[PDB]
């Protein structure tokens, strides 16, 4: 199970894409949820 999440994230032809897409999803939810404002502002 977790091996299918790790391999596709660090040792696959498309692994570079997945990291950037995941970082985008986390960064937007960080900002839009208000957690960024409560910490950075």
């Amino acid at each position: 199970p977790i091996t299918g999440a790790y391999n596709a994230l660090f040792v696959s032809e498309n692994a570079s894409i997945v990291r950037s897409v995941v970082a985008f999803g986390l960064a937007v939810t960080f900002l839009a949820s208000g957690w960024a404002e409560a910490i950075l502002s």
């Binding site: 894409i17 897409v21 970082a23 985008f24 960064a27």
Partner: protein
């Protein structure tokens, strides 16, 4: 006949649309205001600017620089007016970049740019841009190195369109046509863009039909703080990079910091050390190689209080 146009134009305006601006500005808030990409540099830099008038705008600038791909010296002068803007700058090596924008109509403006390298070295580019700004859309056509002397059209032609769909949503299109050599066949690319803009946040996406996708998100985190995310996917191998950054506006300084999936950390601090003097510190750190690039720059503005009586010419076509 006007009978249809009258009902069409009236119904058009009833939806409260507004001009969505240029396609190239669809991600300005993230890529230019928040991210450091356009401010990063290395070495030493000093800009000396003398302003001679504000209406018409006329100023002279001298840049001294010693750094990576920074020309030792660059002279620049610009003249601006409510209907026109002329700007020219030349390197110590004779590289001349020019800009000439003129407003034929308050909605129609022509932008011409020339890059003239030494005669033997390089290649010279001539760019003619025609921008039309309507009540709710913008249309643009760029012709770069157009040629018909070989008996057929040649060069790069870029068509741009951005349309307001709702007061917040704008959708757009980009089309390119290329035929540098008549012997070679034309090559054409189409890119789709769109943007959703609200008061506190802005979402944008650019999708090249070839596979690349660039999405950006900007959000204001209070009066003095704003942050943004920029994702770029390239599938021409597959490569993707996401940059997250924030900008802080203080009373005398502006601090920008960003981190990206490739482990590069960079920050830019601009601080008003004096009324005419602005200091800039830029530092880029690559965590995989542990290498840092430091840039220290200064900007000075001679004109000061002498010309404050004048106020800037309105809507100069920069």
């Amino acid at each position: 006949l006007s009978d249809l146009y009258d009902a069409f134009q009236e119904r058009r305006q009833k939806l409260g649309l507004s001009n969505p601006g240029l396609v190239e500005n669809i991600a300005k808030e993230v890529q230019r205001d928040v991210l450091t990409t356009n401010l990063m540099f290395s070495g030493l830099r000093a800009d000396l600017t003398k302003a001679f008038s504000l209406n018409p705008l006329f100023q002279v600038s001298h840049q001294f620089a010693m750094g990576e791909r920074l020309s030792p010296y660059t002279f620049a002068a610009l003249y601006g007016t409510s209907k026109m803007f002329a700007q020219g700058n030349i390197d110590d090596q004779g590289n001349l970049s020019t800009t000439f924008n003129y407003r034929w109509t308050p909605s129609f403006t022509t932008k011409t740019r020339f890059q003239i390298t030494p005669g033997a070295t390089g290649q010279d580019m001539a760019q003619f841009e025609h921008e039309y700004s309507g009540a709710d859309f913008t249309a643009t056509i760029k012709a770069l190195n157009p040629s018909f002397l070989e008996g057929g059209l040649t060069g790069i032609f870029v068509g741009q369109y951005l349309q307001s769909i709702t007061p917040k949503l704008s959708l757009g299109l980009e089309a390119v046509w290329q035929r540098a050599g008549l012997t070679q066949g034309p090559d054409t690319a189409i890119s789709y863009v769109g943007r959703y803009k609200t008061e506190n946040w802005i979402a944008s996406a650019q999708l090249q039909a070839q596979g690349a996708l660039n999405a950006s998100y900007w959000q204001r985190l209070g009066e003095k703080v704003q942050a943004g995310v920029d994702m770029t996917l390239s599938v021409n191998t597959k490569e993707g990079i996401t940059t997250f950054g924030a900008k802080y506006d203080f009373r005398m300084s502006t601090f920008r910091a960003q981190i990206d999936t490739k482990g590069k950390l960079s920050c830019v601090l601009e601080k008003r050390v004096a009324a005419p003097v602005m200091m800039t510190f830029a530092a880029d750190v690559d965590h995989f190689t542990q290498q840092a690039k430091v840039g220290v720059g200064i900007s000075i503005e001679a004109g000061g209080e002498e010309l404050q009586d004048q106020q800037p010419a309105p809507n100069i076509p920069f």
